[PDB]
Amino acid sequence: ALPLRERLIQTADHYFRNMESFDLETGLTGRTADCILKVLPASFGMPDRTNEECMAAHIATRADMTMKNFKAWRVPGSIPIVDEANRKVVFHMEIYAEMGDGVYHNEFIFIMTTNDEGTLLKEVAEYVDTAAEKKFAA
Amino acid sequence: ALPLRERLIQTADHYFRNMESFDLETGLTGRTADCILKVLPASFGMPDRTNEECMAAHIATRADMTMKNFKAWRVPGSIPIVDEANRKVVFHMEIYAEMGDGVYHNEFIFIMTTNDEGTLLKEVAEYVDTAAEKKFAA
Ligand SMILES: [Ca+2]
Numbered sequence A, B: 001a002l003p004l005r006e007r008l009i010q011t012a013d014h015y016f017r018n019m020e021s022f023d024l025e026t027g028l029t030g031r032t033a034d035c036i037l038k039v040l041p042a043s044f045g046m047p048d049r050t051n052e053e054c055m056a057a058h059i060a061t062r063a064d065m066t067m068k069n070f071k072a073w074r075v076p077g078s079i080p081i082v083d084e085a086n087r088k089v090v091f092h093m094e095i096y097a098e099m100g101d102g103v104y105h106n107e108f109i110f111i112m113t114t115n116d117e118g119t120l121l122k123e124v125a126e127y128v129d130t131a132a133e134k135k136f137a138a
Protein backbone atom coordinates (compact mmCIF):
# COMPACT_ATOMS: atom_id res chain seq x y z
CA ALA A 1 0.00 0.00 0.00
CA LEU A 2 1.40 3.35 -1.16
CA PRO A 3 0.13 6.89 -0.52
CA LEU A 4 -2.12 8.05 -3.34
CA ARG A 5 0.24 10.89 -4.27
CA GLU A 6 3.20 8.53 -4.66
CA ARG A 7 1.13 5.79 -6.31
CA LEU A 8 -0.05 8.28 -8.93
CA ILE A 9 3.59 9.17 -9.66
CA GLN A 10 4.67 5.53 -10.01
CA THR A 11 1.79 4.78 -12.39
CA ALA A 12 2.44 7.85 -14.54
CA ASP A 13 6.20 7.21 -14.59
CA HIS A 14 5.68 3.66 -15.88
CA TYR A 15 4.68 5.15 -19.24
CA PHE A 16 8.28 6.29 -19.75
CA ARG A 17 9.67 3.02 -18.37
CA ASN A 18 7.59 1.06 -20.88
CA MET A 19 9.00 3.19 -23.71
CA GLU A 20 12.64 2.71 -22.70
CA SER A 21 12.25 -1.10 -22.65
CA PHE A 22 9.65 -1.31 -25.41
CA ASP A 23 9.16 -4.64 -27.17
CA LEU A 24 6.37 -5.73 -29.50
CA GLU A 25 5.83 -9.04 -27.68
CA THR A 26 5.20 -7.36 -24.32
CA GLY A 27 3.89 -4.13 -25.85
CA LEU A 28 2.06 -1.46 -23.85
CA THR A 29 1.70 -2.02 -20.10
CA GLY A 30 0.16 -0.10 -17.24
CA ARG A 31 -2.85 1.16 -19.22
CA THR A 32 -6.55 0.45 -19.22
CA ALA A 33 -8.19 -1.28 -22.18
CA ASP A 34 -9.77 2.04 -23.26
CA CYS A 35 -6.69 4.24 -22.87
CA ILE A 36 -6.21 7.16 -25.27
CA LEU A 37 -3.05 8.98 -26.37
CA LYS A 38 -3.63 12.67 -27.09
CA VAL A 39 -1.15 14.87 -28.97
CA LEU A 40 -1.29 18.63 -28.26
CA PRO A 41 -1.81 21.17 -29.72
CA ALA A 42 -4.70 20.45 -32.11
CA SER A 43 -2.97 22.51 -34.82
CA PHE A 44 -0.36 19.76 -35.20
CA GLY A 45 -3.05 17.56 -36.75
CA MET A 46 -2.47 14.27 -34.91
CA PRO A 47 -5.74 12.50 -34.00
CA ASP A 48 -6.30 10.69 -30.73
CA ARG A 49 -5.24 7.04 -30.73
CA THR A 50 -6.25 3.96 -28.74
CA ASN A 51 -3.95 1.31 -27.27
CA GLU A 52 -4.14 -0.51 -30.63
CA GLU A 53 -3.66 2.42 -33.01
CA CYS A 54 -0.44 3.42 -31.25
CA MET A 55 0.83 -0.14 -31.71
CA ALA A 56 0.15 0.04 -35.45
CA ALA A 57 2.13 3.28 -35.63
CA HIS A 58 4.93 1.61 -33.67
CA ILE A 59 5.00 -1.33 -36.11
CA ALA A 60 4.90 0.91 -39.18
CA THR A 61 7.81 2.98 -37.83
CA ARG A 62 9.93 -0.16 -37.41
CA ALA A 63 9.76 -0.82 -41.16
CA ASP A 64 10.99 2.69 -42.07
CA MET A 65 13.68 3.59 -39.50
CA THR A 66 15.68 1.96 -36.73
CA MET A 67 15.09 3.23 -33.18
CA LYS A 68 17.66 2.67 -30.43
CA ASN A 69 18.44 4.08 -26.98
CA PHE A 70 15.18 5.62 -25.85
CA LYS A 71 15.69 7.84 -22.81
CA ALA A 72 13.21 9.87 -20.76
CA TRP A 73 14.13 12.15 -17.86
CA ARG A 74 12.49 15.01 -16.01
CA VAL A 75 13.87 18.49 -16.61
CA PRO A 76 16.29 19.21 -13.72
CA GLY A 77 14.61 21.31 -11.06
CA SER A 78 11.04 20.35 -11.99
CA ILE A 79 8.72 18.47 -9.64
CA PRO A 80 5.72 16.21 -10.42
CA ILE A 81 2.46 18.15 -10.30
CA VAL A 82 -0.11 15.79 -8.76
CA ASP A 83 -3.86 16.41 -8.39
CA GLU A 84 -5.11 13.50 -6.29
CA ALA A 85 -8.78 14.44 -6.63
CA ASN A 86 -8.69 14.39 -10.45
CA ARG A 87 -6.12 11.54 -10.56
CA LYS A 88 -3.78 13.64 -12.71
CA VAL A 89 0.02 13.95 -12.85
CA VAL A 90 1.86 16.63 -14.85
CA PHE A 91 5.46 16.19 -16.03
CA HIS A 92 8.04 18.44 -17.68
CA MET A 93 10.04 15.96 -19.74
CA GLU A 94 12.73 15.55 -22.37
CA ILE A 95 12.80 12.58 -24.76
CA TYR A 96 15.92 11.20 -26.43
CA ALA A 97 16.10 8.58 -29.18
CA GLU A 98 18.65 7.52 -31.80
CA MET A 99 17.05 7.19 -35.24
CA GLY A 100 18.61 6.22 -38.55
CA ASP A 101 18.83 9.89 -39.56
CA GLY A 102 20.68 11.13 -36.49
CA VAL A 103 19.40 12.11 -33.04
CA TYR A 104 15.85 12.81 -31.88
CA HIS A 105 15.51 15.10 -28.86
CA ASN A 106 12.77 17.48 -27.74
CA GLU A 107 11.00 18.97 -24.72
CA PHE A 108 7.49 17.96 -23.70
CA ILE A 109 4.69 18.54 -21.21
CA PHE A 110 2.92 15.32 -20.19
CA ILE A 111 -0.49 14.98 -18.54
CA MET A 112 -1.46 11.55 -17.20
CA THR A 113 -4.89 10.43 -16.00
CA THR A 114 -5.30 7.20 -14.03
CA ASN A 115 -8.28 5.09 -12.98
CA ASP A 116 -10.05 5.50 -9.64
CA GLU A 117 -7.60 3.16 -7.90
CA GLY A 118 -4.61 4.97 -9.42
CA THR A 119 -3.04 1.75 -10.72
CA LEU A 120 -3.57 1.94 -14.51
CA LEU A 121 -3.29 4.78 -17.02
CA LYS A 122 -6.59 6.01 -18.48
CA GLU A 123 -5.37 8.97 -20.55
CA VAL A 124 -1.99 10.27 -21.72
CA ALA A 125 -1.73 13.80 -23.15
CA GLU A 126 1.49 15.39 -24.41
CA TYR A 127 2.15 18.90 -25.69
CA VAL A 128 4.65 18.78 -28.53
CA ASP A 129 7.27 21.12 -30.02
CA THR A 130 5.44 21.68 -33.30
CA ALA A 131 8.29 23.42 -35.14
CA ALA A 132 10.72 20.54 -34.57
CA GLU A 133 8.21 17.73 -35.15
CA LYS A 134 7.02 19.26 -38.43
CA LYS A 135 10.67 19.50 -39.48
CA PHE A 136 11.28 15.87 -38.53
CA ALA A 137 8.22 14.66 -40.46
CA ALA A 138 9.09 16.66 -43.58
CA ALA B 1 -11.75 32.93 3.26
CA LEU B 2 -11.77 30.35 0.47
CA PRO B 3 -10.61 26.74 0.36
CA LEU B 4 -7.07 26.62 -0.97
CA ARG B 5 -8.08 24.86 -4.20
CA GLU B 6 -10.56 27.59 -5.14
CA ARG B 7 -8.14 30.30 -3.95
CA LEU B 8 -5.32 28.92 -6.11
CA ILE B 9 -7.62 28.77 -9.15
CA GLN B 10 -8.77 32.37 -8.68
CA THR B 11 -5.21 33.62 -8.19
CA ALA B 12 -4.12 31.76 -11.32
CA ASP B 13 -7.19 32.81 -13.32
CA HIS B 14 -6.44 36.46 -12.52
CA TYR B 15 -3.49 36.27 -14.93
CA PHE B 16 -5.90 35.89 -17.85
CA ARG B 17 -8.34 38.45 -16.41
CA ASN B 18 -5.50 40.96 -16.02
CA MET B 19 -4.42 40.42 -19.64
CA GLU B 20 -7.95 40.84 -21.03
CA SER B 21 -8.26 44.28 -19.39
CA PHE B 22 -4.57 45.21 -19.51
CA ASP B 23 -3.78 48.89 -18.99
CA LEU B 24 -0.32 50.43 -18.76
CA GLU B 25 -1.43 52.66 -15.87
CA THR B 26 -2.71 49.70 -13.84
CA GLY B 27 -0.03 47.30 -15.07
CA LEU B 28 0.51 43.75 -13.89
CA THR B 29 -1.59 42.70 -10.89
CA GLY B 30 -1.77 39.62 -8.71
CA ARG B 31 1.98 38.98 -8.83
CA THR B 32 4.81 39.10 -6.33
CA ALA B 33 7.64 41.58 -6.82
CA ASP B 34 9.93 38.73 -7.97
CA CYS B 35 7.49 36.98 -10.32
CA ILE B 36 9.11 35.35 -13.35
CA LEU B 37 7.49 34.58 -16.71
CA LYS B 38 8.82 31.51 -18.51
CA VAL B 39 8.19 30.57 -22.15
CA LEU B 40 8.51 26.85 -22.95
CA PRO B 41 10.20 25.09 -24.66
CA ALA B 42 13.80 26.32 -24.42
CA SER B 43 14.24 25.66 -28.16
CA PHE B 44 12.05 28.70 -28.92
CA GLY B 45 14.76 30.99 -27.56
CA MET B 46 12.87 33.22 -25.11
CA PRO B 47 14.67 34.05 -21.84
CA ASP B 48 12.87 34.28 -18.52
CA ARG B 49 11.50 37.76 -17.83
CA THR B 50 10.74 39.70 -14.66
CA ASN B 51 7.74 41.89 -13.85
CA GLU B 52 9.42 44.91 -15.48
CA GLU B 53 10.87 43.08 -18.49
CA CYS B 54 7.39 41.83 -19.43
CA MET B 55 6.08 45.40 -19.21
CA ALA B 56 8.87 46.52 -21.55
CA ALA B 57 7.70 44.06 -24.20
CA HIS B 58 4.13 45.32 -23.75
CA ILE B 59 5.36 48.87 -24.38
CA ALA B 60 7.56 47.82 -27.30
CA THR B 61 4.63 46.01 -28.93
CA ARG B 62 2.32 49.04 -28.73
CA ALA B 63 4.59 51.09 -31.02
CA ASP B 64 4.65 48.51 -33.84
CA MET B 65 1.17 46.93 -33.82
CA THR B 66 -2.25 47.50 -32.27
CA MET B 67 -3.78 44.87 -29.99
CA LYS B 68 -7.53 44.74 -29.39
CA ASN B 69 -10.05 42.29 -27.92
CA PHE B 70 -7.72 40.04 -25.95
CA LYS B 71 -9.65 36.87 -25.06
CA ALA B 72 -8.68 33.77 -23.10
CA TRP B 73 -10.68 30.66 -22.25
CA ARG B 74 -10.11 27.14 -21.02
CA VAL B 75 -10.43 24.45 -23.67
CA PRO B 76 -13.89 22.84 -23.27
CA GLY B 77 -13.67 19.58 -21.34
CA SER B 78 -10.47 20.58 -19.55
CA ILE B 79 -10.39 21.03 -15.78
CA PRO B 80 -7.88 23.01 -13.65
CA ILE B 81 -5.18 20.68 -12.33
CA VAL B 82 -4.41 21.86 -8.78
CA ASP B 83 -1.55 20.68 -6.55
CA GLU B 84 -2.19 22.41 -3.22
CA ALA B 85 1.02 21.13 -1.61
CA ASN B 86 3.14 22.56 -4.45
CA ARG B 87 0.95 25.69 -4.89
CA LYS B 88 0.66 24.88 -8.60
CA VAL B 89 -2.26 25.18 -11.02
CA VAL B 90 -2.23 23.82 -14.59
CA PHE B 91 -4.52 25.05 -17.36
CA HIS B 92 -5.33 24.10 -20.95
CA MET B 93 -5.95 27.44 -22.62
CA GLU B 94 -6.64 29.21 -25.89
CA ILE B 95 -5.72 32.88 -26.36
CA TYR B 96 -7.36 35.18 -28.92
CA ALA B 97 -6.11 38.64 -29.85
CA GLU B 98 -6.63 41.00 -32.78
CA MET B 99 -3.51 42.56 -34.31
CA GLY B 100 -2.86 44.86 -37.24
CA ASP B 101 -1.86 41.88 -39.41
CA GLY B 102 -4.99 39.82 -38.82
CA VAL B 103 -6.05 37.47 -36.01
CA TYR B 104 -3.80 35.93 -33.36
CA HIS B 105 -5.02 32.65 -31.86
CA ASN B 106 -3.24 29.59 -30.49
CA GLU B 107 -3.47 26.83 -27.88
CA PHE B 108 -1.39 26.76 -24.70
CA ILE B 109 -0.50 24.77 -21.61
CA PHE B 110 -0.17 27.08 -18.60
CA ILE B 111 1.55 26.33 -15.29
CA MET B 112 1.14 28.79 -12.41
CA THR B 113 2.94 28.90 -9.07
CA THR B 114 1.65 30.91 -6.11
CA ASN B 115 3.07 32.07 -2.80
CA ASP B 116 2.57 30.15 0.44
CA GLU B 117 -0.62 32.14 1.11
CA GLY B 118 -1.97 31.39 -2.37
CA THR B 119 -2.83 35.05 -2.99
CA LEU B 120 -0.12 36.14 -5.46
CA LEU B 121 1.52 34.66 -8.54
CA LYS B 122 5.19 33.72 -8.13
CA GLU B 123 5.85 32.04 -11.49
CA VAL B 124 4.01 31.64 -14.80
CA ALA B 125 5.24 29.07 -17.34
CA GLU B 126 3.62 28.63 -20.76
CA TYR B 127 4.36 26.07 -23.48
CA VAL B 128 3.58 27.58 -26.88
CA ASP B 129 2.99 26.42 -30.46
CA THR B 130 6.53 26.86 -31.77
CA ALA B 131 5.59 26.40 -35.44
CA ALA B 132 2.94 29.14 -35.20
CA GLU B 133 4.88 31.61 -33.03
CA LYS B 134 7.92 31.52 -35.33
CA LYS B 135 5.50 32.12 -38.20
CA PHE B 136 3.96 35.11 -36.41
CA ALA B 137 7.33 36.72 -35.66
CA ALA B 138 8.48 36.23 -39.26
CA1 LIG C 1 14.84 19.40 -30.28
Ligand SMILES: [Ca+2]
Binding pocket: A043, B105, B106, B107, B132
Ligand atom coordinates in the same frame (compact mmCIF):
# COMPACT_ATOMS: atom_id res chain seq x y z
CA1 LIG D 1 -3.09 29.13 -34.40
